[PDB]
mmCIF file of C-alpha atoms in Angstrom:
data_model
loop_
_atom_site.group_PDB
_atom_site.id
_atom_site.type_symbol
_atom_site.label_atom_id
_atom_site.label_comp_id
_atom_site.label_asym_id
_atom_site.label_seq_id
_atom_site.Cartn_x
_atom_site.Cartn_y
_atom_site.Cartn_z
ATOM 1 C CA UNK F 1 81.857 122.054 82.241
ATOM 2 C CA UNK F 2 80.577 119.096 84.487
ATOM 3 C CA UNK F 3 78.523 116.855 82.054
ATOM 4 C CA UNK F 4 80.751 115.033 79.671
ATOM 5 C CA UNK F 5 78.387 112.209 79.423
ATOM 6 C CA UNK F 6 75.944 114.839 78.247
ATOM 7 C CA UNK F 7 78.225 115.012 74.566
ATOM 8 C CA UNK F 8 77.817 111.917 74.343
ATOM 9 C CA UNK F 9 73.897 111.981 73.558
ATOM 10 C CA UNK F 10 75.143 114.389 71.004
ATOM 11 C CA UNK F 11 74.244 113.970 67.350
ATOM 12 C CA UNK F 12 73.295 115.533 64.395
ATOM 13 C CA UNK F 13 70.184 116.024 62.578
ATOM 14 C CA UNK F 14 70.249 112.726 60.102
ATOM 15 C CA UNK F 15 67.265 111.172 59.594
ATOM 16 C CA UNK F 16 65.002 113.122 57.652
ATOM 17 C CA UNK F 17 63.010 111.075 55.176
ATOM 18 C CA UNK F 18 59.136 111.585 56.404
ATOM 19 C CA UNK F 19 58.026 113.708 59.482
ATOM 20 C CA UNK F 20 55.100 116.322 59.396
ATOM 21 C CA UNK F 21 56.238 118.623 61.986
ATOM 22 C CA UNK F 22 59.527 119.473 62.923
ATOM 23 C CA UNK F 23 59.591 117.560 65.978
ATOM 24 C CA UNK F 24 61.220 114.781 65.531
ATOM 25 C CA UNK F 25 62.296 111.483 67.240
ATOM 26 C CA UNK F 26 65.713 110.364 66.714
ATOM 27 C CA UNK F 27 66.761 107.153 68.776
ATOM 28 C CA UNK F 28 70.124 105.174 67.404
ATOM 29 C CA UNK F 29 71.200 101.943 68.129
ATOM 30 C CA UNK F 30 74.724 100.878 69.771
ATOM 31 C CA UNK F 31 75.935 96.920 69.760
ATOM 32 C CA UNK F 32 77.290 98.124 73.353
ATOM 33 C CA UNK F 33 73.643 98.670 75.097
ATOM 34 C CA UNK F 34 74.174 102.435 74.008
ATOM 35 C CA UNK F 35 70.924 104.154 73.245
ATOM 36 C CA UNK F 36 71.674 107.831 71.257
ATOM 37 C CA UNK F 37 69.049 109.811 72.519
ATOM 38 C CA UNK F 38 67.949 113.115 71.046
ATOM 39 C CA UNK F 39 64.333 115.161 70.217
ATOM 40 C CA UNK F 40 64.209 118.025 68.290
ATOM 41 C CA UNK F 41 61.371 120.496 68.171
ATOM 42 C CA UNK F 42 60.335 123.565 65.687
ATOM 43 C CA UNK F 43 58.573 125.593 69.113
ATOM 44 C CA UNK F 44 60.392 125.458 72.344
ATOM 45 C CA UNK F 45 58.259 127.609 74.656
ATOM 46 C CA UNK F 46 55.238 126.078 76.202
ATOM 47 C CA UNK F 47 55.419 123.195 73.266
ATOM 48 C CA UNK F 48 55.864 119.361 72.838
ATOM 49 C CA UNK F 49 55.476 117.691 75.741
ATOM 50 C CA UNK F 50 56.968 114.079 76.407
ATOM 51 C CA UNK F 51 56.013 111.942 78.513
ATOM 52 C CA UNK F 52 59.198 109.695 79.537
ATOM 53 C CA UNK F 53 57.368 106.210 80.258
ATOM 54 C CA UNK F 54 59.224 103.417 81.236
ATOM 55 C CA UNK F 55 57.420 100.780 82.036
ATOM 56 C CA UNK F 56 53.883 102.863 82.133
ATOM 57 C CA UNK F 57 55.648 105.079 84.681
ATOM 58 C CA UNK F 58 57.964 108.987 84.007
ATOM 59 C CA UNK F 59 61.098 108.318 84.734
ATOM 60 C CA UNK F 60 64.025 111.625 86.356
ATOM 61 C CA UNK F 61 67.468 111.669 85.639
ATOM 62 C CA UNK F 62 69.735 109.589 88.275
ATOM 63 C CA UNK F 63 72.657 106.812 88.112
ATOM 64 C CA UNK F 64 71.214 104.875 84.544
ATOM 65 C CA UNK F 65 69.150 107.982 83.192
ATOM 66 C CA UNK F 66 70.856 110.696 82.082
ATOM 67 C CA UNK F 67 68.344 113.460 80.396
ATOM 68 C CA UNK F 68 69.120 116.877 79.365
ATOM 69 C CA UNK F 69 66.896 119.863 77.565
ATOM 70 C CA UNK F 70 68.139 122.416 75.260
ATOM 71 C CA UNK F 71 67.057 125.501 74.555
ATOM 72 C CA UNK F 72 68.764 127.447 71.819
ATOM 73 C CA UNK F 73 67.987 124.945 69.108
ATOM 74 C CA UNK F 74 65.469 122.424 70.726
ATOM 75 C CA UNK F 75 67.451 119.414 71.620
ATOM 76 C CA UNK F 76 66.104 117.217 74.310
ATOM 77 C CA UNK F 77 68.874 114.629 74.471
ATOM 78 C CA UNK F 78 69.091 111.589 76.701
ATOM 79 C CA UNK F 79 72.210 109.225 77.215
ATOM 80 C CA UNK F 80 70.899 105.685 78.438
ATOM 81 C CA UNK F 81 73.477 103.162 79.510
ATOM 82 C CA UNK F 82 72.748 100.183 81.250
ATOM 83 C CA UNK F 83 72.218 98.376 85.064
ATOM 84 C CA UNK F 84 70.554 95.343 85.016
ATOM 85 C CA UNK F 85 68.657 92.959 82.698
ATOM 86 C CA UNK F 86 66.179 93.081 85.550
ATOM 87 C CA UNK F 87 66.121 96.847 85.463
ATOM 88 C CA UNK F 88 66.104 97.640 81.980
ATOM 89 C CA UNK F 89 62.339 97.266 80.724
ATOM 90 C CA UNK F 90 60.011 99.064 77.883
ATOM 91 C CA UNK F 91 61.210 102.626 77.503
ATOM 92 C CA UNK F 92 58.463 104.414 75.202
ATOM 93 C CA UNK F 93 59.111 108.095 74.710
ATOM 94 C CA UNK F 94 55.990 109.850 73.182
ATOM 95 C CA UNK F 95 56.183 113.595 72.268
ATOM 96 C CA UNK F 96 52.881 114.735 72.066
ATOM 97 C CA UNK F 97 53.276 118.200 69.906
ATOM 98 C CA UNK F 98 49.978 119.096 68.174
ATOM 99 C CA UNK F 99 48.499 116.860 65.967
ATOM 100 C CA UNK F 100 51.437 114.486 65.611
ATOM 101 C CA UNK F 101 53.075 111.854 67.982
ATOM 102 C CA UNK F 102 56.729 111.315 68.474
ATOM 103 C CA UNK F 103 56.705 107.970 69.669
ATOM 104 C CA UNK F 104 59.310 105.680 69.994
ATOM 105 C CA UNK F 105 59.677 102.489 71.713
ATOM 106 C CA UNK F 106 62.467 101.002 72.643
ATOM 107 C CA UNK F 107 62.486 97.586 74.779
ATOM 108 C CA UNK F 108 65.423 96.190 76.053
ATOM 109 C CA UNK F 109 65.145 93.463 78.073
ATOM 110 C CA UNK F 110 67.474 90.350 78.660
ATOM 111 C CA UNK F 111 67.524 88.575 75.484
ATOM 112 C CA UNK F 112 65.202 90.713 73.793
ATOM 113 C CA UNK F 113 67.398 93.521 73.606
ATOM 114 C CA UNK F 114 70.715 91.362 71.995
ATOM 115 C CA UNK F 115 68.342 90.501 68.817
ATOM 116 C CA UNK F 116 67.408 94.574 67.947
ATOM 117 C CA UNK F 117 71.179 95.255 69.033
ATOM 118 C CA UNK F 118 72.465 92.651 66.581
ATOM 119 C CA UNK F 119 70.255 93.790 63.778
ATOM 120 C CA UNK F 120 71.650 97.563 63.899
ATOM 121 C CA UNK F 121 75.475 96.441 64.683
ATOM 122 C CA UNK F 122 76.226 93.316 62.837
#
């Protein structure tokens, strides 16, 4: 026991509605600047590879990323919380697994970011 902040990221598999592989892309939305983070993947070994980009560039766990990979079901879940409206940019995760593209992108960004925030926690 160390990472507490890592059960945070934690959530269940919800949104289901239309994905062709089972690697999905599951990014939820907190009023708070609170980004729920998690991947999922059908293979594990030597499959799905994401490319963290923020800002055109991979980004490693440190003080505002927090990133963690399981491997016992497939959960690749990150916890993002916030440091500056100067700092926080375009975060665009893209899981490139086969022939299909997990991409999400998620800008926050001064102002930018209260409008999306508002429209998910009214």
């Amino acid at each position: 026991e160390e990472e507490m902040k890592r059960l945070l990221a934690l959530s269940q598999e919800h949104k289901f509605p239309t994905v062709p592989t089972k690697s999905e892309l599951a990014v939820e939305i907190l009023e708070k600047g609170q980004v729920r983070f998690w991947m999922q993947a059908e293979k594990l070994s030597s499959n799905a590879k994401v490319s963290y980009i923020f800002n055109e560039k991979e980004i490693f766990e440190g003080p505002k990323y927090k990133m963690h990979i399981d491997r016992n079901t497939g959960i690749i879940e990150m916890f993002m919380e916030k440091l500056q409206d100067e700092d926080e940019g375009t975060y665009t995760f893209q899981i490139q697994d086969g022939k299909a593209t997990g991409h999400s992108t998620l800008v926050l960004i001064g102002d930018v970011y209260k409008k999306l925030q508002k429209e998910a926690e009214f």
